[PDB]
Amino acid sequence: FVEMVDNLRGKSGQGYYVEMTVGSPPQTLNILVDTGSSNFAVGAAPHPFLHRYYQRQLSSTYRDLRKGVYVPYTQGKWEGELGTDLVSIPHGPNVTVRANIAAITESDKFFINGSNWEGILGLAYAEIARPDDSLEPFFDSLVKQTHVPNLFSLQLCGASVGGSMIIGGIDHSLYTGSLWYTPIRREWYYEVIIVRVEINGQDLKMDCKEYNYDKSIVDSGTTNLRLPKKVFEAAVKSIKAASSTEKFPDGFWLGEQLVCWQAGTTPWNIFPVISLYLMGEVTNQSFRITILPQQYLRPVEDVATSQDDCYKFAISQSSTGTVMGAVIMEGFYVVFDRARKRIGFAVSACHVHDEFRTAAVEGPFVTLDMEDCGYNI
Numbered sequence: 001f002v003e004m005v006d007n008l009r010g011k012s013g014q015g016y017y018v019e020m021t022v023g024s025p026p027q028t029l030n031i032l033v034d035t036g037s038s039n040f041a042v043g044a045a046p047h048p049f050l051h052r053y054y055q056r057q058l059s060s061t062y063r064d065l066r067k068g069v070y071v072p073y074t075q076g077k078w079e080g081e082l083g084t085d086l087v088s089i090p091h092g093p094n095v096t097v098r099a100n101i102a103a104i105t106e107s108d109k110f111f112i113n114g115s116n117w118e119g120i121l122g123l124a125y126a127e128i129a130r131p132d133d134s135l136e137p138f139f140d141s142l143v144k145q146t147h148v149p150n151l152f153s154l155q156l157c158g159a160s161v162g163g164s165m166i167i168g169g170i171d172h173s174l175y176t177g178s179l180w181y182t183p184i185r186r187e188w189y190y191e192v193i194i195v196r197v198e199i200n201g202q203d204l205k206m207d208c209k210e211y212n213y214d215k216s217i218v219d220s221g222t223t224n225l226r227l228p229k230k231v232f233e234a235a236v237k238s239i240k241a242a243s244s245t246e247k248f249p250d251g252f253w254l255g256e257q258l259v260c261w262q263a264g265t266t267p268w269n270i271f272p273v274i275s276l277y278l279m280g281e282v283t284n285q286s287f288r289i290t291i292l293p294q295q296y297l298r299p300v301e302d303v304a305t306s307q308d309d310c311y312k313f314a315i316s317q318s319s320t321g322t323v324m325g326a327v328i329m330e331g332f333y334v335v336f337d338r339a340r341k342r343i344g345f346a347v348s349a350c351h352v353h354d355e356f357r358t359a360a361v362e363g364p365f366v367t368l369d370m371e372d373c374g375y376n377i
């Protein structure tokens with residue numbers, strides 16, 4: 001799959017996009033890769049933030065579904081008009097599919113001023129598609145209309161970011177060691193179950209339901225490791241204790257202010273590793289993924305008012321459950337094995353580390369009562 005390696009680009013804090021084409025003749029657009037939503041939605045009007053936008057009037061293969069879609073979400077909103085057209089991924093498999101496209105005609109806080117993407121590719125399942133599950137997501141259309149296998153994998157490498165989206169397979173040069181798989185609990189978001197959490201090997205010793213209240217998902221469209229409120233408190237308390245050779249203000253831990261060091265002398269050593277144990281493939285079997293401060297202390301570049309190496313604490317509290325965003329995914333090669341309802345993790349060959357510690361995927365471990373860790377209404 002050499003042709004798909006390095007097909008992702010981006011900038012820090014702005015996410016990862018892939019090149020796509022829509023319509024006939026093909027119109028090229030950069031599209032954010034989002035495993036936490038399920039609509040293919042593209043800018044279709046000249047918003048001033050946009051480098052370009054889908055011009056349906058130029059496409060002979062465009063078909064109008066004569067239907068609108070209104071999509072508020074937690075941090076913004078978009079609105080648009082539904083249709084279908086021919087879509088392809090130049091640095092992806094050599095195919096063209098007829099897919100649903102929402103032509104975005106109005107938005108708020110959706111497009112980012114200064115970003116180089118003009119649309120969003122929701123890779124999750126029909127259950128959370130807008131307006132309803134009858135609007136078949138792109139990846140479903142792709143697999144149904146071609147012989148592309150029903151899986152994809154993401155290597156997100158974290159000021160220009162890069163990575164690979166391998167569509168229909170796995171590229172073994174992108175990771176080291178073995179893949180370890182966790183079941184997709186339910187096909188809506190990429191929902192998984194965290195069974196145990198450690199800070200520097202020290203169990204938080206919470207009831208594991210707390211870790212998945214009310215869900216845990218893998219999400220390339222979020223920067224942070226987001227944790228349920230009670231788990232975040234406990235995590236921060238333990239992280240504070242482990243790093244207490246230096247002290248930092250209460251605002252920092254809340255992501256309300258940054259912290260700065262002299263260039264090339266950030267004290268990585270004083271920050272602990274974070275380990276999430278995930279439900280394994282076998283009864284009573286788990287594995288663990290481990291990230292470094294290099295993943296959860298994220299450098300902020302655009303601080304015009306400062307001169308030093310500044311960082312944001314990128315673990316935060318949530319009311320929507322655990323979100324394994326970029327802070328997790330940048331540690332690993334992640335295989336969204338839809339065909340087998342599972343997600344594979346392996347150590348990423350591009351993850352940022354130091355000479356003393358590296359991100360890790362280890363198993364098998366013996367963990368009982370893993371089914372009780374799931375939340376049910």
Ligand SMILES: NC1=N[C@@]2(CO1)c1cc(NC(=O)c3ccc(Cl)cn3)ccc1Oc1cnc(C3=CCCOC3)cc12
Nearest residue numbers: 013014015016034036037073128219220221222223326
């Ligand atoms: N996963 C996720 N997708 C977001 C929110 O979180 C969404 C995320 C982003 N993400 C980023 O800009 C971004 C920034 C940095 C990094 Cl590392 C990743 N992504 C942008 C627009 C956007 O716009 C969205 C629009 N709609 C949704 C919906 C989710 C559930 C069903 O209804 C729509 C989600 C989203």
